[PDB]
C-alpha cells in the first residue's frame with residue numbers, strides 16, 4: 001500500500017523537515033561512538049510516506065487517545081532511527097520494532113534530537129556501523145531516519161540520567177535530568193500511536 005513521494009528541495013515542506021533535522025543535532029556523551037562524529041548532515045532526499053491503511057490506523061487510535069484525554073492527542077513530530085526502517089514504512093510500527101531493553105521498558109522509542117535517533121540507524125549502540133565499511137562514523141554511506149507523527153496522550157514523566165504504558169497513561173516521557181543540552185525522548189507501547197510521515201536520506205558530515 002505504501003508509495004514514497006519525493007519532495008523538491010524548493011518545497012517549504014522539505015525545508016522545514018530539513019531544518020528540524022539539522023537544528024536538533026547535539027553532542028553525545030559517548031563522544032560519537034554510536035552515531036559518529038558530526039555537527040550537521042548532508043540531506044540527500046526527503047520523501048513523504050503515503051499509505052492510506054496505515055494513516056487510518058494511526059488516526060483511529062489518535063481519536064481514541066484524544067477522547068481519553070479531554071480531546072487532546074498531544075501529538076508531536078519526532079525522530080526514529082531503526083534497522084527496520086524499510087519494514088516500518090511498508091507495514092507500520094508494531095511490537096517487532098520495540099527496543100526490548102530500553103530505559104523505559106519494551107516499547108517503541110522516539111527522540112526530539114535527530115542525532116539521538118541517528119545512533120540507532122545501524123542498530124542498538126550503532127551495532128557494527130555501516131554494512132559496507134563497518135564504520136559507525138561512516139561519512140560515505142547513505143543513512144535513513146524517519147520523522148514521525150506520534151500521539152503521546154497523557155504521558156508519564158520520568159526524570160532520568162512490548163510492555164504496557166503505566167496505568168492511566170498513553171506514553172512515557174524520558175526527561176533529561178543530568179545533561180542540560182539533551183532533549184526529551186519518548187516511548188509508546190502501541191504501534192498504532194505513530195505514523196512514519198517522512199523518510200529522510202542523509203549522510204553525517206565530517207567536521208572541518
Ligand SMILES: O=C(O)COc1ccc(-c2nc3ccccc3c(=O)[nH]2)cc1
Nearest residue numbers: 080081082099109110111117120124185
Ligand atoms: O535493534 C533492535 O534490536 C530493535 O530495534 C530498535 C529500533 C530503534 C531503536 C531506537 N531507540 C531509541 C531510543 C531512544 C531515542 C530514540 C531511539 C530511536 O530512534 N530508535 C532501538 C532499537
Ligand SMILES: [Zn+2]
Nearest residue numbers: 130133138141
Ligand atoms: Zn560506510
